[PDB]
Design an enzyme around this catalytic site. Structure first.
Site, short mmCIF file in Angstrom:
data_model
loop_
_atom_site.label_atom_id
_atom_site.label_comp_id
_atom_site.label_asym_id
_atom_site.label_seq_id
_atom_site.Cartn_x
_atom_site.Cartn_y
_atom_site.Cartn_z
N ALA A 1 47.33 43.19 34.44
CA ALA A 1 46.63 42.29 35.37
C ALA A 1 45.22 42.77 35.71
O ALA A 1 45.07 43.97 36.00
CB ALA A 1 47.43 42.15 36.63
N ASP A 2 44.24 41.87 35.65
CA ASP A 2 42.85 42.20 36.05
C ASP A 2 42.52 41.27 37.21
O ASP A 2 43.05 40.16 37.21
CB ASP A 2 41.91 41.98 34.89
CG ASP A 2 41.77 40.55 34.40
OD1 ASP A 2 40.99 39.79 35.02
OD2 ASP A 2 42.43 40.21 33.40
N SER A 3 41.68 41.69 38.15
CA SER A 3 41.42 40.88 39.37
C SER A 3 41.60 39.39 39.14
O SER A 3 42.50 38.83 39.75
CB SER A 3 40.04 41.15 39.86
OG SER A 3 39.15 41.31 38.73
N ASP B 1 43.19 37.74 37.69
CA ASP B 1 44.54 37.21 37.37
C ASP B 1 45.53 37.72 38.40
O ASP B 1 46.67 37.31 38.34
CB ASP B 1 44.88 37.41 35.90
CG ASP B 1 45.57 38.70 35.51
OD1 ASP B 1 46.75 38.87 35.85
OD2 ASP B 1 44.92 39.51 34.81
#
Ligand code: DGD
Ligand code: DGD
Ligand code: LMG
Ligand code: LMG
Ligand code: LMG
Ligand code: SQD
Ligand code: SQD
Ligand code: Y01
Lengths: 75, 390, 85, 169, 189
Positions: free
Chosen positions: C38-40, C42
């Site tokens: 997960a990246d910000s 998302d």
């Protein structure tokens, strides 16, 4: 005068029988519609060139057999 | 007072040097103006209808005369005739405004309070002024007379220290506030600075300055000027165009503001009247008796202005009616004689007010011209810059 | 006022798996979001998918500090619990 | 302007109505424009309408400086009424100094004054105009059919002209 | 302080009657439509706790109406005719078809709005970089969720953008928007 009043609710002016004659003579009346249950009232719409611009005037017609030739003569 | 114990010779040479007639000695501290209300005969407070109707009718007649003339010769007259009719109308209205000021302090017709309220409102509206706000500002002025940093409803002087602060902030004498002060207190337009007063009323049109219990009364006060400027200033324009406006309203307005401003400015300003801060020697009676100047006019002018120059009497006896102000003064001049100051309206006085007494410095506690003061404090700026060497 | 935290947890994990594309055994109740990929941008779309599935609204101040699956589950459960009042 | 210490000072309860400086700005604009126009042309309606609206809107923007009071609400109502009347005169009757020679060239249309007044009306409605809500048309005999009060129902029936009907309730 | 007798440290703001009924219980804050009949959270609660469904219906429909939704004014006696047409003069079948169409439309609109919100998140995360000049690249999830539920006034958005552009400081948020009260004039509306 026109300069010292508020503009209010466009309605039909009233000519008596005579400034109608002079106006249609000077070539200023542009179109005429007859109405009245006895067909003796006129709603006349002037043309822009007249003094006062296009307005809608009302005239009462008392029988005059010269009217039609006068009208049709001046366009 | 500024000129303390010293013989009559220096007093009188100062007097005729500044244009005053009798300068003032020195009043003891620790007193109050309301004391000397006991020196007044009780007959001075009596009500009579004669002087009332005379005071409300003479200025009305002068106004009507000016207007009848001006309309009889609407715009065919040269500029000097216009100027003279404007001066006459302005003076008549200053008289009616003095009557309205009397009704604001509740001392014109006390028996009918509703009638005097309505009359004051009506007479104040054409100058675009509010009656309740006027009452408030005048009371605040009476409570703080000549108090430094607090008498904002009077001719508070421009002090040297705030000028120096503004010059340090401006980085020179060329800023906007600089030139504004420059033309407002160096040119004859000073005799109209009362218009600034007019704009400071309407305290931002902000009901958050007042006590809530009075909102409806204050709002009503603001609605009488507006209604005028909303129902009558149109008509005038619509019936006379720009010229028919500048000659029928704006010139009498400027004349009236001349009268207001000159009266007040001469009343509470002179080189021998100091402006003590609070806690630093401010005294109430000393400032209301010794720190006041009485202007003398020709009796025609006086009777046209409803004795609007006599201000000292109605500061010691706030209920003293308007037509008893001359007589009462004669009484006080007998007992408070050596302390009062008096002057006659002459050209020399106004020239001195414009050209000489411009900045108030508290160290010397006196008034000094603007230009010499600013160049002196600028030379001291140069010398502190030299002192800023390291 | 009483929420079956078990059901909420199963549904949270299924939604997370379907959103990210990893399989349900890898999503553990203590797994952070940064490692699941997960990246910000998302960790927000996951919040939107959660709200859309459960039909609730998240409390934002606490939603700023969501970093493990168990916090997601507990936020959702504290929201569902305080529904009548 | 900008205030680095607290940037969101405009959204702070200062005690007045949000639409308070806009009202005074619009009053000043109306007054100035009306006077300028009526001097530049010769018509007397522009200055009269402009200065009338300016007076009324300055009074409303004065009352709007304390929004909790009762005058604080009557101010908003007055300002809304004036702006609505301006919009109406503009889009339905037009202005006297805007007549032309033609007939469709001089038709009442919405220009820039009507647009500003409409924006103001929307701004009053979407900020707060909810005061004095107890002024409405009086209750019917239809509202008190199911009310639990016999005295009140009798009073309403009496006022509406049914004092003699039998209350089999 | 005005208070003659008693004054706490925070001034008392006179709260008034509410002027509108609350959002139901079934609705969300967003644009996407509700649920036709039963919400989804109802499945994760005790059967003896799901009585709030019908209680909320009773409250909105019959027993808690704020006396401001019962004002008789000239605007409302015409809205009555609009509504009575919709409810008694139109057959339920055409109303059902229109209901389905409106649902589909609202789903499309919600999808568009969500796309736009994510775009705004990148844009402001980029603006905070100019602001701080250096490192800061994140955004605020709080602001994303507040944007999705329509809890910001336009002025708050503008002031937040300015604060970002000038001082980075991505975690300083405008307060929150308050709900709009029902507008009333007089007998008129
Ligand atoms: C000072 C600015 C004067 C001005 O502009 O003032 C003009 C109008 C306000 O003037 C009002 O103008 C009205 C007539 O407006 C019409 O006529 C105007 C020119 O006469 C413009 O055409 C304007 O768009 C149009 O609406 C009446 O004359 C009112 O008496 C007069 O007060 O402001 C405006 O256009 C409104 C300004 C745009 C809002 C920003
Ligand atoms: C195209 C398909 C039209 C088919 C049809 O048979 O179209 C005719 C329909 C009317 O259809 C009638 O529509 C009725 C709809 O009833 C439904 O809806 C009713 C309430 O609307 C009742 O609830 C009823 O119980 C429920 O079944 C039944 O379907 C009837 O059998 C059917 O004749 O008119 C229309 O298309 C609608 C008229 C719009 C014309 C403009
Ligand atoms: C008529 C007789 C009526 C009877 C009543 C008499 C009562 C007397 C009380 C009246 C008090 C008047 C005070 C006058 C006064 O305050 O003004 C004197 C005040 C000066 O006063 C000081 O002014 C400073 C300026 O900010 C600060 O405000 C100080 O607080 C203020 O005290 O005048 C000003 O405000 C001057 C600045 C404004 C600039 C003038 C604008 C000039 C415009 C030109 C006009 C067109 C010319 C053509
Ligand atoms: C865009 C301009 C800034 C937005 C603005 O109108 O601010 C509107 C703010 C709103 O003003 C404040 O609003 C708050 C909202 O809750 C509170 O209600 C306060 O009572 C109210 O004063 O007012 C300003 O400070 C206006 C200043 C500039 C006036 C414009 C002149 C034209
Ligand atoms: C465009 C129509 C304006 C309506 C937009 C409302 C936006 C809004 O709510 O902003 C948010 C704030 C209102 O602020 C609201 O205030 C409430 C208290 O009344 C509470 O504080 C709410 O929390 C807050 O949302 O708006 C402003 O501060 C005022 C904006 C004024 C905009 C009007 C523009 C029209 C002016 C044109 C006239 C030109 C004349 C010159
Ligand atoms: C014939 C009748 C004619 C009638 C004539 C009427 C004319 C008068 C109106 C003329 C126009 C008035 C506009 C004044 C606007 C102003 O001064 O706001 C005053 C505000 C303070 O607001 C304030 O700020 C205060 C808080 S604070 O201390 O200032 O921070 C707070 O008290 C207050 O609520 C808040 O509003 O000043 C500001 O903080 C800086 C201005 C920010 C916005 C700039 C816009 C200004 C125009 C730009 C071009
Ligand atoms: C002649 C008309 C003169 C009036 C001029 C119009 C003034 C401007 C519009 C008034 C503000 C709207 C108020 C409001 O939105 O109420 C809520 C209303 C319902 O009225 C509401 O309806 C409610 C019952 S219900 O919702 O319909 O079930 C009821 O509680 C409430 O009293 C009733 O007002 O909701 C609407 O959707 C109104 C939209 C119509 C707007 C078009 C205006 C035309 C111009
Ligand atoms: C236009 C002519 C023909 C009629 C007379 C109009 C007056 C009734 C108007 C025009 C000038 C106006 C004043 C101009 C300046 C101000 C300041 C203004 O408030 C502020 O500027 C507050 C402080 C700030 O903004 O920083 C509003 C009130 C007031 C006194 C106005 C009140 C109403 C006045 C006197």
């Amino acid at each position: 005068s026109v300069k010292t009043a508020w503009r209010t609710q466009e309605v039909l002016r009233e000519l008596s029988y005579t400034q109608l004659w002079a106006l249609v003579g000077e070539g200023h009346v542009a179109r005429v519609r007859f109405y009245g249950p006895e067909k003796n009232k006129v709603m006349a719409t002037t043309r822009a060139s007249a003094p006062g611009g296009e307005r809608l005037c009302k005239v009462v017609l008392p029988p005059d057999p010269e009217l039609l030739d006068h009208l049709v003569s001046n366009g | 007072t500024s000129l303390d114990g010293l013989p009559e010779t220096q007093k009188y040479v100062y007097a005729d040097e500044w244009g005053f007639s009798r300068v003032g000695a020195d009043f003891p501290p620790g007193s109050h103006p309301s004391l000397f209300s006991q020196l007044l005969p009780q007959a001075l407070f009596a009500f009579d209808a004669r002087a009332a109707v005379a005071a409300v009718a003479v200025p009305l007649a002068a106004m009507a005369a000016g207007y009848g003339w001006l309309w009889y010769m609407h715009s065919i007259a040269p500029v000097w005739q216009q100027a003279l009719c404007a001066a006459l109308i302005g003076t008549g209205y200053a008289g009616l405004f003095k009557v309205a000021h009397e009704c604001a302090m509740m001392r014109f017709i006390p028996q009918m309070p509703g009638l005097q309220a309505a009359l004051g409102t009506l007479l104040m509206a054409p100058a675009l002024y509010s009656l309740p706000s006027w009452r408030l500002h005048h009371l605040h002025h009476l409570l703080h007379t000549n108090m430094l940093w607090q008498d904002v409803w009077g001719w508070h002087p421009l002090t040297k220290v705030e000028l120096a602060d503004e010059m340090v902030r401006s980085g020179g004498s060329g800023g906007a506030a600089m030139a504004a002060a420059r033309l407002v207190l160096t040119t004859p337009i000073k005799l109209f600075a009362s218009v600034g007063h007019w704009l400071r009323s309407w305290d931002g049109l902000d009901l958050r300055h007042f006590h809530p219990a009075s909102y409806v009364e204050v709002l009503s006060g603001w609605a009488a000027p507006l209604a005028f400027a909303g129902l009558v200033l149109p008509a005038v324009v619509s019936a006379g165009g720009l010229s028919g406006f500048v000659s029928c309203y704006l010139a009498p307005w400027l004349v009236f503001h001349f009268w207001l401003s000159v009266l007040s400015l001469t009343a509470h300003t002179a080189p021998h009247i100091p402006w003590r801060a609070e806690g630093d020697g401010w005294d109430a009676g000393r400032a209301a008796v010794a720190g006041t100047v009485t202007l003398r006019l020709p009796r025609p002018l006086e009777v046209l202005l409803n004795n609007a120059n006599y201000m000292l009497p109605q500061a010691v006896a706030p209920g003293l009616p308007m037509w008893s102000a001359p007589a009462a003064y004669a009484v006080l001049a007998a007992r408070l004689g050596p302390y009062l100051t008096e002057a006659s309206m002459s050209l020399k006085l106004l020239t001195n007010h414009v050209t000489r007494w411009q900045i108030y410095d508290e160290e010397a506690h006196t008034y000094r011209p603007m230009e010499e003061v600013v160049d002196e404090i600028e030379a001291d700026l140069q010398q502190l810059a030299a002192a800023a060497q390291q | 006022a009483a929420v079956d935290k078990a059901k909420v947890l199963e549904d949270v994990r299924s939604i997370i798996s379907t959103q990210l594309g990893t399989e349900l055994e890898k999503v553990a109740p203590e797994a952070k979001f940064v490692d699941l990929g997960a990246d910000s941008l998302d960790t927000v779309e996951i919040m939107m998918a959660l709200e859309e599935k459960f039909e609730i609204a998240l409390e934002e101040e606490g939603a700023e500090k969501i970093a493990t699956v168990q916090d997601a589950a507990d936020m959702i459960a504290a929201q569902i619990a305080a529904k009548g009042n | 302007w900008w205030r680095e210490d607290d940037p969101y000072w405009p959204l702070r309860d200062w005690g007045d109505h949000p639409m308070r400086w806009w009202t005074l700005a619009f009053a000043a604009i109306m007054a100035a424009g009306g006077l300028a126009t009526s001097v530049a042309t010769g018509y007397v309606e522009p200055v009269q309408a402009g200065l009338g609206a300016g007076a009324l809107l300055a009074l409303a923007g004065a009352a709007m400086s304390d929004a909790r009071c009762v005058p604080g609400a009557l101010g908003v109502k007055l300002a809304w009424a004036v702006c609505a009347l301006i919009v109406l005169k503009e889009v339905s009757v037009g202005w006297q100094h805007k007549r032309k020679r033609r007939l469709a060239a001089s038709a009442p249309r919405l220009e820039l004054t009507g647009l500003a007044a409409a924006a103001l009306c929307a701004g009053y409605m979407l900020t707060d105009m909810s005061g004095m809500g107890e002024v409405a048309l009086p209750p019917n005999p239809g509202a008190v059919f199911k009310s639990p009060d016999v005295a009140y129902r009798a009073s309403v029936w009496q006022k509406w002209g049914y004092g003699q009907v039998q209350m089999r309730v | 302080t005005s208070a003659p007798f008693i004054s706490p440290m925070t001034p008392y703001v006179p709260e008034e009657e509410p002027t509108r009924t609350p959002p139901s219980i079934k609705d969300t804050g967003t644009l996407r439509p509700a649920s036709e009949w039963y919400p989804q959270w109802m499945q994760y609660r005790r059967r003896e706790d799901n009585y709030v469904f019908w209680q909320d219906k009773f409250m909105r429909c019959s027993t808690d109406i704020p006396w401001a939704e019962k004002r008789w004014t000239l605007f409302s006696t015409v809205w009555y005719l609009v509504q009575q047409l919709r409810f008694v003069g139109t057959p339920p079948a055409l109303r059902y078809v229109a209901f389905l169409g409106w649902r589909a439309l609202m789903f499309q609109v919600y999808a568009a709005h969500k796309a736009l919100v994510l775009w705004q998140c990148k844009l402001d995360a980029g603006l905070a970089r100019i602001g701080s000049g250096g490192a800061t690249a994140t955004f605020s999830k709080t602001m994303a969720l507040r944007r999705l539920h329509w809890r910001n006034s336009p002025l708050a958005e503008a002031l937040y953008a300015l604060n970002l552009y000038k001082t980075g400081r991505v975690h300083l948020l405008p307060p929150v928007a308050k709900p709009i009260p029902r507008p009333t004039f007089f007998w008129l509306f």
